[PDB]
Design an enzyme around this catalytic site. Structure first.
Site, PDB file in Angstrom:
ATOM      1  N   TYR A  45       0.842  -1.201   0.000  1.00 54.42           N
ATOM      2  CA  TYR A  45       0.000   0.000   0.000  1.00 54.42           C
ATOM      3  C   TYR A  45       0.877   1.251   0.000  1.00 54.42           C
ATOM      4  O   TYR A  45       2.001   1.222   0.469  1.00 54.42           O
ATOM      5  CB  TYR A  45      -0.916  -0.009   1.238  1.00 54.42           C
ATOM      6  CG  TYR A  45      -0.219   0.211   2.589  1.00 54.42           C
ATOM      7  CD1 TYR A  45       0.432  -0.822   3.260  1.00 54.42           C
ATOM      8  CD2 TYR A  45      -0.110   1.478   3.120  1.00 54.42           C
ATOM      9  CE1 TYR A  45       1.145  -0.603   4.432  1.00 54.42           C
ATOM     10  CE2 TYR A  45       0.640   1.731   4.240  1.00 54.42           C
ATOM     11  CZ  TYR A  45       1.177   0.676   4.963  1.00 54.42           C
ATOM     12  OH  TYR A  45       1.816   1.028   6.072  1.00 54.42           O
ATOM     13  N   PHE A  55       3.200  10.699   4.608  1.00 49.79           N
ATOM     14  CA  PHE A  55       3.112   9.606   3.641  1.00 49.79           C
ATOM     15  C   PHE A  55       3.744   8.318   4.176  1.00 49.79           C
ATOM     16  O   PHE A  55       4.752   8.367   4.863  1.00 49.79           O
ATOM     17  CB  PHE A  55       3.896   9.935   2.368  1.00 49.79           C
ATOM     18  CG  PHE A  55       3.515  11.293   1.806  1.00 49.79           C
ATOM     19  CD1 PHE A  55       3.980  12.482   2.388  1.00 49.79           C
ATOM     20  CD2 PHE A  55       2.709  11.388   0.669  1.00 49.79           C
ATOM     21  CE1 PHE A  55       3.611  13.725   1.863  1.00 49.79           C
ATOM     22  CE2 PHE A  55       2.352  12.638   0.145  1.00 49.79           C
ATOM     23  CZ  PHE A  55       2.791  13.798   0.748  1.00 49.79           C
ATOM     24  N   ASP A  56       3.218   7.145   3.801  1.00 56.20           N
ATOM     25  CA  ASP A  56       3.626   5.874   4.383  1.00 56.20           C
ATOM     26  C   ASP A  56       3.442   4.828   3.297  1.00 56.20           C
ATOM     27  O   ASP A  56       2.385   4.798   2.703  1.00 56.20           O
ATOM     28  CB  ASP A  56       2.768   5.476   5.583  1.00 56.20           C
ATOM     29  CG  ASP A  56       2.952   4.038   6.100  1.00 56.20           C
ATOM     30  OD1 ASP A  56       4.110   3.603   6.185  1.00 56.20           O
ATOM     31  OD2 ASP A  56       1.955   3.340   6.457  1.00 56.20           O
ATOM     32  N   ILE A  75      -7.601  -0.169  10.626  1.00 56.29           N
ATOM     33  CA  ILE A  75      -8.764   0.706  10.691  1.00 56.29           C
ATOM     34  C   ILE A  75      -9.957   0.039   9.997  1.00 56.29           C
ATOM     35  O   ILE A  75      -9.700  -0.748   9.047  1.00 56.29           O
ATOM     36  CB  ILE A  75      -8.450   2.101  10.122  1.00 56.29           C
ATOM     37  CG1 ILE A  75      -7.872   2.051   8.677  1.00 56.29           C
ATOM     38  CG2 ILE A  75      -7.548   2.868  11.016  1.00 56.29           C
ATOM     39  CD1 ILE A  75      -7.712   3.429   7.987  1.00 56.29           C
ATOM     40  N   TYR A 101      -9.133   7.146  12.227  1.00 55.53           N
ATOM     41  CA  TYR A 101      -8.603   7.412  13.560  1.00 55.53           C
ATOM     42  C   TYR A 101      -9.440   8.389  14.374  1.00 55.53           C
ATOM     43  O   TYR A 101      -9.072   8.653  15.507  1.00 55.53           O
ATOM     44  CB  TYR A 101      -7.149   7.885  13.553  1.00 55.53           C
ATOM     45  CG  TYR A 101      -6.266   6.770  13.032  1.00 55.53           C
ATOM     46  CD1 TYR A 101      -5.876   5.716  13.836  1.00 55.53           C
ATOM     47  CD2 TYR A 101      -5.921   6.699  11.700  1.00 55.53           C
ATOM     48  CE1 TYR A 101      -5.050   4.716  13.351  1.00 55.53           C
ATOM     49  CE2 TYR A 101      -5.139   5.668  11.182  1.00 55.53           C
ATOM     50  CZ  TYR A 101      -4.693   4.654  12.004  1.00 55.53           C
ATOM     51  OH  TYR A 101      -3.852   3.673  11.435  1.00 55.53           O
ATOM     52  N   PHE A 118      -5.584   5.913   0.529  1.00 59.65           N
ATOM     53  CA  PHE A 118      -4.669   4.842   0.181  1.00 59.65           C
ATOM     54  C   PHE A 118      -4.805   4.348  -1.274  1.00 59.65           C
ATOM     55  O   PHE A 118      -5.918   4.295  -1.824  1.00 59.65           O
ATOM     56  CB  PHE A 118      -4.913   3.583   1.023  1.00 59.65           C
ATOM     57  CG  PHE A 118      -4.701   3.749   2.535  1.00 59.65           C
ATOM     58  CD1 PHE A 118      -5.700   4.269   3.341  1.00 59.65           C
ATOM     59  CD2 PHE A 118      -3.472   3.441   3.098  1.00 59.65           C
ATOM     60  CE1 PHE A 118      -5.523   4.354   4.730  1.00 59.65           C
ATOM     61  CE2 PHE A 118      -3.337   3.485   4.470  1.00 59.65           C
ATOM     62  CZ  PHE A 118      -4.317   4.059   5.267  1.00 59.65           C
TER      63      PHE A 118
END
Ligand SMILES: COc1cc2cc(OC)c1OC[C@H](O)[C@@H](O)CCOC(=O)[C@@H]1CCCCN1C(=O)[C@H]2C1CCCCC1
Length: 128
Positions: A45, A55-56, A75, A101, A118
């Site tokens: 992802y 960003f991740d 989540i 969240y 995402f």
């Protein structure tokens, strides 16, 4: 951009139809099976905050993100959105805080009442 496209043309996949999780399929998978609750799921992802400050990506960790669907380890929006995907599918999800969240956020990683974006690729899922 990708998030604005999701706002305007993406499917509301929440039960309550409150637009809290919107989806576009960007690359179609193969087969008819989608994961059941309890299944082991492997994904790649990319994700970001709608404020553009964070960003991740799984590719940072150089390895798939692995989690048990429906087991509250991610989540709500992931349990909902990954359950709709086929093996090999790439989708875009845009997610209101109620499905992420929340009001409390996950301070300070995730600010209070953050919208999330995402790009998810479903690599594989196995029976528990
Ligand atoms: C709030 O904390 C995190 C958020 C995210 C990534 C984090 O670490 C990789 C992370 O801290 C460790 C925690 O273990 C996470 O697993 C919680 C569950 O995370 C998810 O449910 C969702 C979906 C699964 C992929 C990660 N994702 C996140 O919310 C990322 C966010 C995405 C938005 C930009 C900031 C990171």
């Amino acid at each position: 951009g990708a998030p604005a496209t999701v706002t305007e043309q993406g499917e509301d996949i929440t039960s309550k139809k409150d637009r809290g999780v919107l989806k576009i399929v960007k690359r179609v998978g193969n087969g008819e099976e989608t994961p059941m609750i309890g299944d082991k799921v492997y994904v790649h992802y990319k994700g970001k905050l709608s404020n553009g400050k964070k960003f991740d990506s799984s590719h940072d960790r150089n390895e798939p993100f692995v989690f048990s669907l429906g087991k509250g380890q991610v989540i709500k929006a992931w349990d909902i959105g990954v359950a709709t995907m086929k093996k090999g599918e790439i989708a875009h999800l845009l997610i209101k805080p109620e499905y992420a969240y929340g009001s409390a956020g996950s301070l300070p990683k995730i600010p209070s009442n953050a919208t999330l974006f995402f790009e998810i690729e479903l690599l594989d899922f196995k029976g528990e």
